[PDB]
Amino acid sequence: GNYNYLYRLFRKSNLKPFERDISTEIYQAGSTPCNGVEGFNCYFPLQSYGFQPTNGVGYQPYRVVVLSFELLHAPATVCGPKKSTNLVKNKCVNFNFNG
């Protein structure tokens, strides 16, 4: 098991878009206070992942990258490759040199 990875299966509220929660506070289920420790109605939200090569396919560790493509008043910075064609000469052509 790759127990380094942790996952928050329980949070005090549903996260906002693009919001990160890394709080290690003991998750409380009932009205009984936890006071930083588990016990009655108190558990760990950041459950440790047990990942082994024999695990089921849906349970295997999958690496996921989410690419948020922000485009706002800030000047654009992340453009594409902008593929360039070959060079011609002495021919009537529609040339587009950088716009």
Binding site: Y27, A29, F44, T54, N55
Partner: protein
């Protein structure tokens, strides 16, 4: 006035809308749609756009438990698997240490779960999971009682394993039950040789396990009585008990009568089966089996008389006619266990069940890895958890192992089927479901239709009634033959737990039930010093023997339903569920549920009968039943309890 009734699903309400009085609002918990019941139909009311308690703590308590339970159970299963496939000191240490911590983990969470009562829980699933946790079991008594009960079981386990009886001819020559004594009364046909081994073990084991059995039964009962049971038999009867579910509640006492009622109608089929075995045994033992007397105990082809499979050699309907077996064709095509398991994988995809993960195959010991490391060849299933699956079996390229591979993989497919259920609910409905699934698919695989489809059997094979009766009787000896013995032994054990049979009459009543229920009589008069019922592995090690009888009843119900769903025509023993995708989907409806639902609901949905029945048994062996009457008209039908080989 008027009322509003909510439906979980729209389709359920659509089929339940005519009887609803006009004016009742129609709402579905899924589609969130508004309808008002009106004259001859319903008007769709327009709807707008979408705009502490112990049970909630109980739900959270279970989920946190599931994470650690799944992790530790995986390690415990992995550690035990290494010990089985590689029997070494360190591997034994891993199996013991992981199990000890798993055992320590189980009791800690069980104790914590006890602070979450079941009465205030509205969710049946949440209550059921805690109920499994809050089952104190032997711990309801004092700590000494549990330890000494395990001490008896440890002594029962060791003595049964080390039970060795020495031949009187050579005191140094001693044979254990496995495989020595079993082979004596399964392969050797000499009455005296079988008689000596049958008597020596029951004398040796009986004189050392009878006093332990008396105390062990009392200790098992006392915890059950403290666990709100009439006896430890009722403690085991709680496995099939259903409570809190409308329309499917099953009582512990219902199990007793259902097993009794099912067997009673089997007796007319079994009496002819008993008569034919009795008639055939006279052809080999003229002076040892009476035409009216009960069968000798050791002349049943096995140790305890449980399985009459080896009697097919002596009681074959037609010895000249061949038996259904393509073992030669298994090696004619140059196959192996890996290909056999591939065919087992092909069987599941043929019936419509989805393929399983490759991780199972790379972790499963399908063949013994040489001899340097010892791999346990006892057929078992491994639902390790987190989508890990293994099969412990030294499978070879044979039809016998071909069905074993199907039988063991049937558990694996069933185990992964209810993976969506929580870890506590990641198990079969009862102790006779995973075995039932693997047996019927193997029987369907063993049919000529499956073998011919994949080329294992040539199409020119003659599917005449001669092979039909021979196959049925061999199945009947293995399956139908063990039902009377399985029924009485659990019934005998039930009365021992209940204390009905006097302690000074356990042995006589055991054989009297054998004489009456099974039509089998011991060859040597055994008194209460003997402990013949406990000579079985299950009785000494405290295993509920009713699982096999229920599994046999379930599997036939499962098999017949699949054959009916597959539109099978003709004898039921030739029914093949291969190339029937609907059957697997129909089967998989219960498999995903697992043990969350009552087994009666599971049995009804798969088959159509809420409770157990023997109708598929008659359908499966109907040609044999008529054939048995033809052969048994010249001899007595049934048995006489008074007759014994020793008198």
């Amino acid at each position: 006035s008027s009322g509003v009734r909510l439906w979980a699903t729209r389709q359920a309400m659509l089929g339940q809308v005519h009887e609803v009085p006009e004016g009742w609002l129609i709402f579905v918990a899924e589609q969130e749609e508004l309808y008002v019941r009106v004259q001859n139909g319903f008007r769709k009311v327009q709807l707008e756009a979408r705009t502490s308690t112990i049970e909630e703590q109980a739900k959270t308590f279970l989920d946190k438990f599931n994470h650690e339970a799944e992790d530790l159970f995986y390690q415990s299963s992995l550690a035990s698997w290494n010990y089985n496939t590689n029997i070494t000191e360190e591997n034994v240490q891993n199996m013991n240490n992981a199990g000890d911590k798993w055992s320590a983990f189980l009791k800690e969470q069980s104790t914590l779960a006890q602070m979450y009562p079941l009465q205030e829980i509205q969710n049946l699933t949440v209550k059921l999971q805690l109920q499994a946790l809050q089952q104190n079991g032997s711990s309801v008594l004092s700590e000494d009682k549990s330890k000494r009960l395990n001490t008896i079981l440890n002594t029962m386990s060791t003595i049964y394993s080390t039970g060795k009886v020495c031949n009187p001819d050579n005191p140094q020559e001693c044979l254990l039950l496995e495989p020595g004594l079993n082979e004596i009364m399964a392969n050797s046909l000499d009455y005296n040789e079988r008689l000596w081994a049958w008597e020596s073990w029951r004398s040796e084991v009986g004189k050392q396990l009878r006093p332990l059995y008396e105390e062990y039964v009392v200790l098992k009962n006392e915890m059950a009585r403290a666990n709100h049971y009439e006896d430890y038999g009722d403690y085991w009867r709680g496995d099939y008990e259903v409570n809190g579910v409308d329309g499917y509640d099953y009582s512990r006492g219902q199990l007793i009568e259902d097993v009794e009622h099912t067997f009673e109608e089997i007796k007319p089929l079994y009496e002819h089966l008993h008569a034919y075995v009795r008639a055939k045994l006279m052809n080999a033992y003229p002076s040892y089996i009476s035409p009216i007397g009960c069968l000798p105990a050791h002349l049943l082809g096995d140790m305890w008389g449980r399985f009459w499979t080896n009697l097919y050699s002596l009681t074959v309907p037609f010895g000249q006619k061949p038996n259904i077996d393509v073992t030669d064709a298994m090696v004619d095509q140059a196959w192996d266990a890996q290909r056999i398991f591939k065919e087992a994988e092909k069987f599941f995809v043929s019936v419509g069940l989805p393929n399983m993960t490759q991780g199972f195959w790379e972790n499963s010991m399908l063949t013994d890895p040489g001899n340097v490391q010892k791999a346990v060849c006892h057929p078992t299933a491994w639902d390790l958890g987190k989508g890990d699956f293994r099969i412990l079996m030294c499978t070879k390229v044979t039809m016998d192992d071909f069905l074993t591979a199907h039988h063991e993989m049937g558990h694996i497919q069933y185990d992964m089927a209810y993976a969506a259920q929580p870890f506590l609910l990641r198990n079969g409905a009862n102790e006779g479901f995973h075995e039932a699934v693997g047996e019927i698919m193997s029987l369907s695989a063993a049919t000529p239709k499956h073998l011919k489809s994949i080329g294992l059997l040539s199409p020119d094979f003659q599917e005449d009634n001669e092979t039909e009766i021979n196959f049925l009787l061999k199945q009947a000896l293995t399956i139908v033959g063990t039902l009377p013995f399985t029924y009485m032994l659990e019934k005998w054990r039930w009365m021992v737990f209940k204390g009905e049979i006097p302690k000074d009459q356990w042995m006589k009543k055991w054989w009297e039930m054998k004489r009456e229920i099974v039509g089998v009589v011991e060859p040597v008069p055994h008194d209460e010093t003997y402990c013949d019922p406990a000579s079985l592995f299950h009785v000494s090690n405290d295993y509920s023997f009713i699982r096999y009888y229920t599994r046999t009843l379930y599997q036939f119900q499962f098999q017949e339903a699949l054959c009916q769903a597959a539109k099978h025509e003709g004898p039921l023993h030739k029914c093949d569920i291969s190339n029937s995708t609907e059957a697997g989907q129909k089967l998989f409806n219960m498999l995903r549920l697992g043990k969350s639902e009552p087994w009666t609901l599971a049995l009804e949905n798969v088959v159509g009968a809420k409770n157990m029945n023997v109708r598929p048994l008659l359908n499966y062996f109907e040609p044999l039943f008529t054939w048995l009457k033809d052969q048994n008209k010249n001899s007595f039908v049934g048995w006489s309890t008074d007759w014994s080989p020793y008198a």
